[PDB]
Amino acid sequence: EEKPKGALAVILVLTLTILVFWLGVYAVFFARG
């Protein structure tokens, strides 16, 4: 039919989680600097 809205949904969650994790720990790294 059309745009994989669902798949795009999933990869968005994936992307957001990655950012929570990556940015989250990147902070903690400087905090312990």
Binding site: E1, P4, A9, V10, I11, L14, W22, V25, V28, F29
Partner: protein, 552 residues
């Protein structure tokens, strides 16, 4: 069923041996989860299992049986059997049973020392920690079993190319091929470690081993080995799951590309396990960091390709809006469920991994409980669950024994529990890790050491009980399936539930390129020498062997 598909038997023997290992290893799981919840359950286990000597004997057995024995035997099952049935070809049976005997002789030989508290050295076995020779010789023979499996598949592939001159390798076989080639290159680290150091050491030919070169060679194999665990699960997710879901694999070329990229980038990344090691150049670590980031890409594609296929599947099943396709999936089918949930946990799992792989960020969590949090979402969740759910189509196909409604709902409980527990544990372990709680530690025997982890220590307790119950239910069900004398021969001769593949015009030219495997295997082999060559040359020049220790 066995005389014209005798591959069917050999494949069952791998899977059985593999599910026994999984059970025996997993027993220690609950106790370790409790240990990380500050509850000491080991005097109870030591009563039950009188051979167990320490928390650390337990941990060795938990790693080795699960992440080494179970996972290898499941790949040797799937990544031979799935190509065999797609090609409808018989693997060299002489060779196939030889690989099984090796894996079984190897497993027994190593077991004897493990169970005898003679090599409580964990599944990493880092020198100078010195295990009993039969541990090292057992492991060797166990892992060389896969070298027979490589051959077997290459043989199948050559033979099929001969009867179909110039036709493109079929999907599963292509996966299997790049798979086994990638493993071959990857195994070379460990084999050298064993052949040059750990074997003569344990035998007493030498009195020392350099720990730096030993752990370098270890990790050359060490990282790809996890892909070796993952890809058999990926193969099932790409080519069988979408059929279980009621849809199709939306892209053949994507799956090929994902797998090709694993062939390329699986091995040249080991330094992401040695970020905190000395005597390795910081530039080489930054390089290996970037290539590690790249090795994420294949799984990033996987995620879209696979999420599309299930959206599409959801759509044919009468999907609704943005989220409708999710509810229309076959949630009553454990074969669909198990691997989907595995994929859910894999999202937090991947984000975990990418963090670990960011060089300087590794120092935050390296060797902490966060690392076990990361990998239980990968191997103990995605891989194990896909492995578990897959019994629902694979076991009948091999044995001719059907699956009753009860066992189907039993499975569904097992699957949800295992998933919830793992998730609960994952919150626990990550949280404890950020809180500096180390891993590989018997921390419930020093109760006042880490008070700051009060609340995530609860989760760890909770997981342990949930995952205990799930485990017992798994054993109860699995045996209920193998011990019943129900047999339909006709479902044993029922073709695997391979999925249809959607394909377009552009495919041809791209797929064609990817079917230049010999060229890609040489590209992959070069990347390995470029990444490890300069450093290994530098360590081997300056070998500093130190003597062995037994500290248990």
């Amino acid at each position: 069923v066995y005389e014209a598909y005798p591959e069917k038997k050999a494949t069952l023997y791998f899977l059985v041996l593999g599910f026994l290992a999984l059970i025996v290893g997993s027993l220690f799981g609950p106790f370790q989860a409790l240990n990380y919840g500050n509850v000491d359950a080991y005097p109870l286990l030591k009563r039950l299992l009188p051979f167990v000597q320490s928390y650390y004997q337990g941990l060795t057995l938990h790693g080795v049986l699960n992440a080494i024995v179970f996972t290898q035997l499941f790949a040797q099952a799937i990544m031979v059997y799935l190509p065999a049935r797609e090609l409808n070809m018989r693997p060299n049976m002489g060779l196939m049973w030889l690989s099984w005997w090796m894996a079984f002789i190897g497993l027994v030989v190593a077991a004897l020392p493990l169970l005898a508290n003679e090599a409580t050295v964990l599944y990493t076995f880092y020198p100078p920690l010195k295990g009993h020779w039969a541990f090292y010789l057992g492991a060797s023979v166990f892992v060389l079993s896969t070298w027979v499996s490589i051959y077997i598949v290459l043989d199948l592939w050559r033979r099929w190319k001969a009867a179909n001159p110039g036709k493109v390798t079929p999907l599963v076989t292509y996966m299997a091929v790049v798979f086994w080639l990638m493993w071959f290159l990857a195994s070379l680290g460990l084999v050298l470690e064993a052949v040059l150091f750990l074997l003569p050491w344990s035998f007493g030919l030498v009195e020392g081993v350099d720990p730096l070169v030993a752990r370098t060679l270890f990790w050359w194999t060490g990282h790809p080995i996890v892909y070796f665990w993952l890809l058999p699960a990926y193969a099932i997710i790409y080519t069988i799951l979408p059929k279980q879901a009621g849809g199709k694999l939306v892209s053949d070329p994507m799956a090929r590309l994902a797998f090709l990229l694993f062939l390329l980038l699986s091995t040249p990344v080991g330094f992401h396990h040695q970020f905190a090691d000395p005597g390795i150049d910081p530039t080489w670590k930054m390089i290996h960091s970037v290539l590690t980031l790249f090795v994420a890409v294949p799984s990033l594609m996987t995620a879209f390709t696979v999420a599309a296929s299930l959206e599409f599947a959801g759509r044919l099943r009468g999907g609704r809006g943005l989220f409708g396709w999710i509810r229309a999936l076959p949630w009553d089918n454990p074969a669909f469920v198990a691997p989907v949930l595995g994929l859910l946990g894999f999202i937090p799992g991947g984000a975990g991994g990418i963090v670990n792989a960011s060089f300087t960020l590794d120092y935050v969590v390296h060797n902490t409980a966060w690392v076990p949090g990361h990998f239980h979402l990968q191997v103990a969740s995605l891989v194990t669950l896909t492995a578990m759910g897959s019994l629902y189509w694979l076991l009948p196909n091999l044995t001719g024994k059907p699956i009753s409604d009860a066992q189907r709902r039993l499975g569904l409980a097992v699957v949800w529990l295992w998933f919830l527990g793992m998730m609960i544990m994952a919150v626990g372990l990550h949280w404890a890790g950020l809180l500096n709680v180390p891993r590989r530690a018997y921390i419930a025997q020093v109760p006042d050491a880490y008070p700051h982890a009060a609340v995530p220590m609860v989760f760890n307790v909770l997981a342990g009980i949930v995952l205990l119950v799930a485990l017992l239910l798994f054993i109860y069900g699995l045996f209920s399936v193998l011990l019943s004398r129900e047999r339909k021969p006709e479902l044993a001769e029922a073709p695997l539930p391979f999925a249809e593949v959607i394909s377009g015009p552009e495919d041809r030219r791209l797929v064609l390129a990817m079917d230049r495997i010999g060229f890609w295997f040489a590209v992959a082999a070069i990347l390995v020498v470029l990444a490890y060559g300069p450093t290994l040359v530098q360590l081997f020049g300056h070998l500093n062997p130190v003597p062995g220790w037994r500290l248990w």
